[PDB]
Design a protein around this ligand. Structure first.
Ligand code: V55
Ligand code: V55
Ligand code: CO
Ligand code: CO
Ligand code: CO
Ligand code: CO
Ligand code: MG
Ligand code: MG
Ligand code: MG
Ligand code: MG
Lengths: 479, 479
């Protein structure tokens, strides 16, 4: 393959496209014998050179990595998420779909097809592996064989066009809670709220509209509510016609937080929109209710965090204003005005990729993990694992050293009934000087002493998005 | 896996154990559209940590790499050679066989089993892939699927215990010509000569004895003769009982060159042994006849080339005396004495891994390729590809640069009837600074301008031994 000599395809961003199997990877330390399950994660990884001769990182085909941990050892299985895009281009031996979220650049032979790369999350639910991309229904796969099933449209009961890559699981019911924005077509202001039973059946789909079309990448879920931030990374057909990146950031637009009842009978009039001054937030650590208030914790930045989705008025990217810090947004459903109740920074540590013990989804919670960027460390990057204790305020930091960087952590509970945070953190470490990757295993509430096990991969993973642990019994692997 | 922190298992020698598939590898330059076939090579690569807690490179399990070149692109498929050793240890989840060529260190549960790692050659013949190790019958595999068949004992017609890893193909008949030393048991002085028909049937096996048991790793073949150098890298049960490496080098023993008729009715009395002063040679570029003389070209060194098979009188390893140079050994079957007719250095370039256009096996020939060690180059190693022209004396050199090293080249003929050397060279390049490997493609008689195509692998291969090209129609791949 002749790939472009551009930053998105060279160095750490060289295409990999490895499908492989390796049991019993070389490792150091002690892998807890308690661990019996697998960590799934996804990397964008282009099957083919881009039609245009350049592209962005968020547009690579989804490649799924599975780390099966059992019997004190770690195995790897890596396979493509075989989206319709993947299959069609594989059959043709060439790229057919074009630029990011831009159907005007597709070959005529794939007009109307799902454009999903399934490259944003590798999520386990209802016995399936979900390879997810927010512009289409989710792909599903067999978590044991990692063969691909296809797109999940829930027996035709789903009528929206799209499905999130940030599903939540409500610990009260076991339901998956999801959204799908641009639900009636590209750049539309329609959004669907979905709930899926533990057995994988669509319970309900509820339609509503948002103040403006924008990237609705993540969201919060509480017992009663969908908690949906409206942040002006906006797109339009006009932008696509002019050859601009689909999304650009508009610093002049307000930010909203919508509180949307989790009800099949939802009507537009039931929704409250709170309004604040322009800022940027993408991910949600957790949301929860307190009396008539709703709290949601997000990494907040002063300005755009996506340089490839540039300022719509032509401003150059500002890295300092892109530094995000975990911040609590609080709104009161009983308040008279549309103002937030408060906006409270929770740490001065800069970071992203927030995570919790997902058994606390929608509930008051004590622990949050993040990828931290400590700019005071030597670099010879997201260079630390960070743990915040909301009860005491205490913070822990683990630095990966001066030639490495880190990927998103994922929490592994010790048992169904264990206390919050009782378990382990796993995360990929980019050993940049060695052009390889490690999988790190930490004791989840004692990270400053470093990982208790380091699993070496004999090759490099690419930049990853989201990932999740599932116990073996949930994914068809051995007891 | 917990592997030792010793040189044989760290750095460039870290275990890899990657089984993978990647079509359409990232590449630069132009892959000749004429190419339609595959290059097979083997790396020792330990499935399990060694029982003793250390080991040598030559004892790693064989991992087979296939580079399928077609339609201007290059694909990789990599799979284990599933020897009985591999299967038994895989079933047990642990190492069962011990030190190199030392059955005294094996677990009692595998006494008497073939100890082969199939780690020295990946050879194509009679529609099969041969994964070869000189202490056992060859393993065979499907060259298209790279599944393993098992050990080849030719329907019981082979009674020797062992089969070489340096088979030759006689261009006159298409027969595979092979030896097997220690043919009646470890450290015995019996050797078998084998010829195999193009259809894979054993034609004959002929037994003889050698002046002393030693590592008979390679050999030459001419129309009339097996050409067998006797070089005193010797082994013994006594050495094994004392915990020494199987082989050690004895500088006080003579070197012999045996000329053995290629005849099923061979008797010991038919053999001529020529004798010379102590030296070291392992590999054979080619051998051929001229009148009543026999010529064989070998990389000759003054002393031992294997530091892990040390001097038997305790001398420290001497790297300068290990530097080998292509040298022609000439004997005359009509000579009265046992002296060589001549010993003639053919180049002052130091090198190993000699190769030819294998259509010239056993014939007078013009071209020879080698891996060269140019110690005058900056190193920031086997660092050059070398081509010798025996007709004009001319030499070509291509340097891989100051952070790389090279593996064995292999010649690809343009067509069955093309002139000698008309075709391409392929070889793996170790990009040590990048911790990855490339496959290089050269125009075989024009190497100084560098490769015409560079195929990037997104991971590192380990040190390799021998490899071979086969056209697609010989290995069940597409026309
Ligand atoms: C990996 O692809 C995407 C990632 C994100 C946020 O991290 C937003 C949109 C994408 O398409
Ligand atoms: C890769 O294993 C071997 C290699 C050699 C010579 O290169 C001799 C004996 C072996 O077992
Ligand atoms: Co219903
Ligand atoms: Co995300
Ligand atoms: Co016969
Ligand atoms: Co050899
Ligand atoms: Mg269904
Ligand atoms: Mg501002
Ligand atoms: Mg047979
Ligand atoms: Mg001498």
């Amino acid at each position: 393959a002749h790939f472009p000599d551009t930053p998105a395809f060279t160095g750490f961003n060289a295409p990999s496209r490895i499908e492989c199997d390796i049991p019993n990877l070389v490792h150091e330390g002690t892998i807890p014998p308690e661990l019996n399950g697998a960590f799934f994660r996804v990397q964008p990884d282009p099957q083919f050179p881009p039609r245009l001769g350049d592209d962005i990182s968020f547009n690579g085909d989804g490649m799924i990595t599975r780390f099966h941990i059992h019997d004190g050892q770690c195995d790897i299985k890596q396979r493509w998420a075989k989206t319709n895009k993947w299959k069609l281009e594989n059959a043709a031996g060439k790229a057919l779909f074009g630029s990011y979220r831009n159907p005007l650049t597709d070959d005529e032979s794939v007009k109307g097809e799902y454009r999903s790369t399934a490259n944003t999350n590798a999520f386990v639910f209802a016995g399936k592996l979900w390879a997810m991309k927010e512009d289409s229904p989710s792909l599903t796969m067999d978590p044991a064989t990692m063969e691909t099933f296809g797109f999940e449209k829930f027996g035709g009961k789903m009528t929206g066009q799209t499905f999130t890559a940030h599903p939540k699981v409500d610990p009260l019911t076991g339901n998956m809670v999801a959204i799908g924005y641009a639900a009636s077509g590209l750049c539309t202001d329609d959004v669907c709220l979905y709930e899926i039973s533990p057995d994988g059946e669509l319970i309900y789909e509820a339609w509503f509209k948002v103040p403006y079309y924008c990237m609705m990448h993540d969201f919060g879920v509480t017992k009663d509510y969908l908690v949906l931030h409206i942040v002006p990374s906006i797109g339009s057909w006009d932008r696509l016609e002019k050859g601009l990146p689909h999304f650009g950031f508009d610093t002049t637009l307000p930010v909203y937080l919508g509180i949307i009842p989790r009800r099949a009978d939802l009507k537009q009039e039931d929704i409250r929109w709170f309004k604040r001054e322009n800022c940027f937030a993408s991910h949600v650590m957790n949301a929860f209710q307190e009396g008539t208030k709703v709290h949601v914790d997000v990494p907040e930045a002063e300005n755009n965090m996506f340089p490839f989705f540039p300022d719509v008025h032509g401003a150059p990217f500002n890295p300092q204003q892109a530094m995000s810090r975990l911040t609590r947004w609080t709104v009161d459903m009983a308040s008279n005005s549309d103002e937030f109740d408060s906006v409270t920074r929770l740490t001065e540590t800069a970071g992203e990729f927030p995570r919790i013990d997902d058994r606390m989804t929608g509930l008051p919670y004590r622990y949050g993990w993040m990828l931290e960027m400590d700019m005071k460390r030597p670099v010879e990057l997201m260079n630390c694992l960070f743990l915040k204790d909301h009860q005491t305020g205490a913070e822990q930091h683990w630095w990966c050293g001066p030639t490495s960087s880190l990927q998103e952590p994922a929490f592994i509970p010790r048992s169904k009934d264990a206390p919050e945070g009782d378990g382990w953190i796993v995360q990929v470490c980019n050993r940049l000087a060695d052009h390889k990757s490690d999988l790190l295993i930490f004791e989840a509430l004692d990270i400053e002493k470093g990982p208790v096990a380091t699993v070496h991969l004999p090759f490099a993973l690419r930049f990853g998005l989201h990932g999740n642990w599932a116990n073996a019994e949930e994914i068809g692997l051995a007891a």
